[PDB]
Write an enzyme that holds these catalytic residues in place. Structure first.
Site, PDB file in Angstrom:
ATOM      1  N   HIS A  31       0.791  -1.221   0.000  1.00 18.30           N
ATOM      2  CA  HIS A  31       0.000   0.000   0.000  1.00 18.30           C
ATOM      3  C   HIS A  31       0.831   1.283   0.000  1.00 18.30           C
ATOM      4  CE1 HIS A  31       0.580  -0.288   4.449  1.00 18.30           C
ATOM      5  NE2 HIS A  31       0.418   1.024   4.426  1.00 18.30           N
ATOM      6  N   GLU A  55      -0.009  -7.778   0.898  1.00 19.73           N
ATOM      7  CA  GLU A  55       0.575  -6.491   1.235  1.00 19.73           C
ATOM      8  C   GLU A  55       2.107  -6.505   1.190  1.00 19.73           C
ATOM      9  OE1 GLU A  55      -1.859  -3.960   0.594  1.00 19.73           O
ATOM     10  OE2 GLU A  55      -0.323  -3.067   1.901  1.00 19.73           O
ATOM     11  N   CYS A 131       5.446   2.709   7.439  1.00 19.05           N
ATOM     12  CA  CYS A 131       5.197   1.493   6.683  1.00 19.05           C
ATOM     13  C   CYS A 131       6.296   1.250   5.647  1.00 19.05           C
ATOM     14  CB  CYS A 131       3.826   1.565   6.025  1.00 19.05           C
ATOM     15  SG  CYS A 131       2.528   0.924   7.135  1.00 19.05           S
TER      16      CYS A 131
HETATM   17  C1  LIG Z   1       1.790   2.503   7.585  1.00 16.89           C
HETATM   18  O1  LIG Z   1       1.034   2.907   6.436  1.00 16.89           O
HETATM   19  C2  LIG Z   1       0.854   2.429   8.823  1.00 16.89           C
HETATM   20  C3  LIG Z   1       1.539   2.141  10.183  1.00 16.89           C
HETATM   21  C4  LIG Z   1       0.882   2.830  11.418  1.00 16.89           C
HETATM   22  C5  LIG Z   1       1.627   2.549  12.717  1.00 16.89           C
HETATM   23  O2  LIG Z   1       2.597   1.825  12.752  1.00 16.89           O
HETATM   24  N1  LIG Z   1       1.270   3.067  13.894  1.00 16.89           N
HETATM   25  C6  LIG Z   1       0.150   3.929  14.195  1.00 16.89           C
HETATM   26  C7  LIG Z   1       0.120   4.237  15.696  1.00 16.89           C
HETATM   27  C8  LIG Z   1      -1.212   3.896  16.348  1.00 16.89           C
HETATM   28  C9  LIG Z   1      -2.085   5.138  16.360  1.00 16.89           C
HETATM   29  C10 LIG Z   1      -3.492   4.765  16.768  1.00 16.89           C
HETATM   30  C11 LIG Z   1      -4.247   4.323  15.543  1.00 16.89           C
HETATM   31  N2  LIG Z   1      -4.872   5.129  14.660  1.00 16.89           N
HETATM   32  N3  LIG Z   1      -5.434   4.315  13.672  1.00 16.89           N
HETATM   33  C12 LIG Z   1      -5.139   3.039  13.985  1.00 16.89           C
HETATM   34  O3  LIG Z   1      -4.398   3.029  15.137  1.00 16.89           O
HETATM   35  C13 LIG Z   1      -5.537   1.834  13.177  1.00 16.89           C
HETATM   36  C14 LIG Z   1      -4.486   1.712  12.088  1.00 16.89           C
HETATM   37  C15 LIG Z   1      -4.586   0.416  11.299  1.00 16.89           C
HETATM   38  N4  LIG Z   1      -4.685  -0.737  12.164  1.00 16.89           N
HETATM   39  C16 LIG Z   1      -5.780  -1.492  12.240  1.00 16.89           C
HETATM   40  O4  LIG Z   1      -6.826  -1.285  11.624  1.00 16.89           O
HETATM   41  O5  LIG Z   1      -5.652  -2.639  13.117  1.00 16.89           O
HETATM   42  C17 LIG Z   1      -6.778  -3.234  13.749  1.00 16.89           C
HETATM   43  C18 LIG Z   1      -7.798  -2.175  14.163  1.00 16.89           C
HETATM   44  C19 LIG Z   1      -6.288  -3.961  14.998  1.00 16.89           C
HETATM   45  C20 LIG Z   1      -7.380  -4.204  12.738  1.00 16.89           C
HETATM   46  C21 LIG Z   1      -3.372   0.283  10.431  1.00 16.89           C
HETATM   47  O6  LIG Z   1      -2.307  -0.085  10.914  1.00 16.89           O
HETATM   48  N5  LIG Z   1      -3.508   0.602   9.153  1.00 16.89           N
HETATM   49  C22 LIG Z   1      -2.386   0.564   8.246  1.00 16.89           C
HETATM   50  C23 LIG Z   1      -2.822   0.646   6.775  1.00 16.89           C
HETATM   51  C24 LIG Z   1      -3.498  -0.594   6.176  1.00 16.89           C
HETATM   52  C25 LIG Z   1      -2.671  -1.848   6.423  1.00 16.89           C
HETATM   53  C26 LIG Z   1      -3.209  -3.030   5.635  1.00 16.89           C
HETATM   54  C27 LIG Z   1      -3.140  -2.719   4.155  1.00 16.89           C
HETATM   55  C28 LIG Z   1      -4.086  -1.565   3.906  1.00 16.89           C
HETATM   56  C29 LIG Z   1      -3.664  -0.328   4.685  1.00 16.89           C
HETATM   57  C30 LIG Z   1      -1.474   1.704   8.603  1.00 16.89           C
HETATM   58  O7  LIG Z   1      -1.930   2.773   8.965  1.00 16.89           O
HETATM   59  N6  LIG Z   1      -0.170   1.457   8.513  1.00 16.89           N
END
Ligand SMILES: *[C@@H](O)[C@@H]1CCC(=O)NCCCCCc2nnc(o2)CC[C@H](NC(=O)OC(C)(C)C)C(=O)N[C@@H](CC2CCCCC2)C(=O)N1
Ligand SMILES: [Cl-]
Ligand SMILES: [Cl-]
Length: 165
Positions: A31, A55, A131
């Site tokens: 992504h 991914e 990421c």
């Molecule tokens: C890189 O694009 C990124 C990494 C984010 C990271 O390492 N830390 C964020 C710190 C936490 C802040 C609190 C927060 N805010 N939103 C979220 O957490 C949820 C983010 C999401 N996680 C998620 O949905 O996990 C569950 C709720 C447990 C299921 C998440 O990590 N999304 C990433 C993007 C997605 C990953 C899969 C491929 C499609 C895009 C993301 O933001 N990654």
């Protein structure tokens, strides 16, 4: 301690980062790859070999792009309980290696996208821009890469790398 050459493998790319595993092989998270452009690192798409899934994205270029690098071993995840390091670089230049205790390999739903990945508990957090950062551990002498940063939990204390097929 991650040596300088190892850090020099971490490279800005799209919305995040990737890692030169060899002079020709570069890995990242699907992504963060930037959409709708025609070249990577100066080469045209027609010249690159892509394997994408879960991914985890893999680029094999035609020529040596990093002749200075010695190839290292790319695993599919790493043993449970392995303590890994995440070689995070920030846009500012700062280096931030994060220790992480790795759990299990699992398919995972994350924002509707399917992720072949490995969870880990942080041992200082990650951020949206991180990421693609590599997960690595030292296997005796050789350094091993097993994943690229892909997601974090609500709290931010648990993280997930996408891993190869
Ligand atoms: C890189 O694009 C990124 C990494 C984010 C990271 O390492 N830390 C964020 C710190 C936490 C802040 C609190 C927060 N805010 N939103 C979220 O957490 C949820 C983010 C999401 N996680 C998620 O949905 O996990 C569950 C709720 C447990 C299921 C998440 O990590 N999304 C990433 C993007 C997605 C990953 C899969 C491929 C499609 C895009 C993301 O933001 N990654
Ligand atoms: Cl190295
Ligand atoms: Cl560097």
């Amino acid at each position: 301690h991650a040596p300088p050459t190892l850090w020099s493998r971490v490279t800005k790319f799209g919305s995040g980062w990737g890692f030169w595993v060899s002079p020709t092989v570069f890995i990242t998270t699907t992504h963060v790859v930037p959409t709708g452009v025609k070249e990577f690192f100066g080469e045209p798409l027609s010249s690159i070999a892509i394997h994408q899934a879960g991914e985890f994205t893999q680029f094999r270029f035609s020529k040596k792009m990093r002749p200075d690098l010695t190839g290292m071993v790319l695993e599919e995840g790493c043993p449970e309980g392995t303590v890994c390091s995440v070689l995070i670089k920030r846009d500012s230049g700062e280096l931030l290696p994060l220790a992480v205790r790795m759990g299990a390999i699992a398919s995972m739903r994350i924002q509707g996208r399917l992720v072949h990945g490995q969870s880990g508990m942080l041992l200082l957090g990650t951020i949206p821009g991180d990421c693609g950062a590599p997960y690595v551990h030292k296997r005796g002498n050789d350094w091993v890469v097993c994943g690229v940063h892909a997601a974090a939990t609500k709290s931010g204390n648990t993280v997930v790398c996408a891993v190869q097929a």
